[PDB]
Design a protein around this motif. Structure first.
Motif, PDB file in Angstrom:
ATOM      1  N   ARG B  11       0.833  -1.182   0.000  1.00 27.45           N
ATOM      2  CA  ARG B  11       0.000   0.000   0.000  1.00 27.45           C
ATOM      3  C   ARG B  11       0.869   1.232   0.000  1.00 27.45           C
ATOM      4  O   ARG B  11       2.095   1.146   0.085  1.00 27.45           O
ATOM      5  N   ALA B  60      -7.093  -4.865  -1.800  1.00 27.69           N
ATOM      6  CA  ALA B  60      -5.800  -5.491  -1.577  1.00 27.69           C
ATOM      7  C   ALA B  60      -4.667  -4.762  -2.329  1.00 27.69           C
ATOM      8  O   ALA B  60      -4.893  -4.137  -3.374  1.00 27.69           O
ATOM      9  N   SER B  61      -3.453  -4.844  -1.795  1.00 26.01           N
ATOM     10  CA  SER B  61      -2.283  -4.330  -2.482  1.00 26.01           C
ATOM     11  C   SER B  61      -1.718  -5.406  -3.415  1.00 26.01           C
ATOM     12  O   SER B  61      -1.055  -5.083  -4.405  1.00 26.01           O
ATOM     13  N   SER B  83      -5.331  -0.914  -9.168  1.00 27.63           N
ATOM     14  CA  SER B  83      -4.555  -0.645  -7.931  1.00 27.63           C
ATOM     15  C   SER B  83      -3.935  -1.875  -7.213  1.00 27.63           C
ATOM     16  O   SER B  83      -3.109  -1.733  -6.312  1.00 27.63           O
TER      17      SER B  83
END
Ligand SMILES: [Br-]
Ligand SMILES: [Br-]
Ligand SMILES: [Br-]
Ligand SMILES: [Br-]
Ligand SMILES: [Br-]
Ligand SMILES: [Br-]
Ligand SMILES: [Br-]
Ligand SMILES: [Br-]
Ligand SMILES: [Br-]
Ligand SMILES: [Br-]
Ligand SMILES: [Br-]
Ligand SMILES: [Br-]
Ligand SMILES: [Br-]
Ligand SMILES: [Br-]
Ligand SMILES: [Br-]
Ligand SMILES: [Br-]
Ligand SMILES: [Br-]
Ligand SMILES: [Br-]
Lengths: 291, 291
Positions: B11, B60-61, B83
């Motif tokens: 993140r 989620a990252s 993302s």
């Protein structure tokens, strides 16, 4: 002044997203069932109650509290968020036949003037519904309760709850729910708080049909409670209910019952119960948007 | 170019909040256990897998996927959010002694060049740890796996998992976890994915001590997985782990396992699984803030 308005317990969107923590002996039993040491002391109930209120009320448009375990305490400790309004339970629960609330009457040791003075905006009355018990006797109680509220500038919330008959074995929960609504759905309260048909189980369409049927018999804004519905199926229950005419929820167990008995209560309330309530409020906002 | 960076799966705050949906036969059994009709078809697994990916990846990252059931499908259907980054499992699970993954080898039918071409940023390798099995043999596999990643510009994620010994009855899970870390905690992978000590149960202080002990033996960023930890206790597990040195989580069951078998999967994923993952990401952001 004795002006009251439904707007004071709704979100900006006009939907109801409300939190119930007024459970009493029923909660002591939950704590017992989760393996807390017995006998469970009253202070465990008020501790959990005021923690739930302070951590979760930021997410609710109202919160329902009981004098018995946490009404005093919540005002004392400014436990209720500013943005959240306060409902006070006005029912005296009577145990019997081995259950903690076998019968319900109006609580006489309730001073609506006192309570209004502490910023309360509404009272709530559970009404046990039995097919072989007198409907007029129920209606009277609701009428007395409506005046107690309205003459004090408070809103009136009723909660008809369906029980099997005293003599007999004929009990069809679904029909009983609908029969209670026929009877009490236009009794001049400001809000109807109702059980979810079919426990929010099965197929979405069968639910929508049952919730539609029900909505037909309620001539006031209504909301669903979570008792009976698995917490995972409650988010959907709210969607279906509101698609059918309901304006929100007034729920407890599906928000915080899973957390009872676990270590680190304040953290559990924050990490487990809060995201569920948050979601539920998001959902009501989404459904009001669709109107 | 074969430059790779840990930043691509974290993140903004630098913490790891990652979603695992690469479970295989282990998931078929979950569906069976939830009362889905048998035999459970492959298409049920990829349906649930791609739904989970499209609904949850925004939170989620990274997301970990498997070729066997949903890697093709997720790229085809642009199921992964923009993302969110993509990890591909590079382990071939071998069943035995009545369990679906008794033994693990490196998957040879994996084209890292293909996968990198589809925007993948990392691969993952499960490593079964047994006290009476050869440590050098494990280390070799990890080395081969590290090169496969790094020579292709991919990150390397290892997942040591602790199993009882082949001959013998001496099995202390906690010690085994720590022994695996001593062995593999500095093997030159980019990320260590580890089981939570004591199943995230008990008192916060005993956990913090065990997580601290563990962190001592890991010389790379590490994260905890959710297998073994009750979903309600996982949010805390992450807090304690990160207070002890961990940089996040790579979790699956605690996000989406409760929803398996229920009606209306996409809605269930949205209303039940998503608020849990969202919270977990909020938590890692909070803990990175504390550094
Ligand atoms: Br609001
Ligand atoms: Br007790
Ligand atoms: Br508490
Ligand atoms: Br609100
Ligand atoms: Br009862
Ligand atoms: Br009936
Ligand atoms: Br169901
Ligand atoms: Br909907
Ligand atoms: Br706590
Ligand atoms: Br982020
Ligand atoms: Br099967
Ligand atoms: Br699905
Ligand atoms: Br992210
Ligand atoms: Br297995
Ligand atoms: Br051992
Ligand atoms: Br525990
Ligand atoms: Br903390
Ligand atoms: Br759905």
């Amino acid at each position: 002044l004795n002006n009251y308005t439904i707007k004071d317990i709704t979100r900006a969107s006009g939907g109801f997203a409300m939190l119930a923590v007024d459970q009493r002996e029923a909660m002591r039993l939950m704590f017992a069932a989760a393996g807390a040491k017995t006998p469970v002391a009253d202070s465990v109930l008020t501790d959990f109650k005021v923690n739930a209120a302070k951590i979760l009320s930021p997410y609710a448009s109202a919160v329902l509290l009981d004098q018995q375990f946490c009404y005093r305490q919540a005002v004392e400790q400014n436990a209720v968020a500013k943005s959240c309004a306060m409902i006070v339970a006005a029912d005296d629960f009577i145990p019997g036949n081995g259950i903690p609330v076998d019968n319900v009457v109006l609580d006489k040791k309730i001073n609506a003037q006192a309570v209004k003075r502490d910023g309360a905006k509404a009272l709530k009355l559970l009404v046990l519904w039995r097919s072989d018990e007198d409907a007029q006797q129920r209606l009277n109680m609701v009428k007395e309760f409506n005046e107690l509220c309205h003459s004090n500038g408070l809103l009136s919330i009723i909660e008809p709850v369906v029980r099997p008959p005293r003599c007999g074995d004929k009990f069809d929960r679904e029909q009983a729910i609908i029969d209670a609504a026929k009877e009490l759905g236009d009794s001049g309260a400001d809000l109807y708080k109702v059980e979810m048909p079919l426990y929010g189980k099965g197929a979405r369409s069968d639910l929508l049909t049952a919730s539609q049927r029900l909505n037909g018999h309620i001539n006031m804004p209504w909301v669903i409670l979570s008792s009976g519905v698995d917490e995972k199926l409650f988010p959907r229950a709210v969607r279906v209910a509101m698609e059918a005419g309901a304006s929100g929820f007034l729920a407890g167990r599906a928000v915080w019952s899973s957390v009872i008995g676990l270590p680190d209560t304040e953290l559990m309330l924050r990490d487990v119960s809060a995201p569920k309530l948050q979601r539920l409020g998001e959902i009501v906002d989404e459904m009001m948007g669709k109107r």
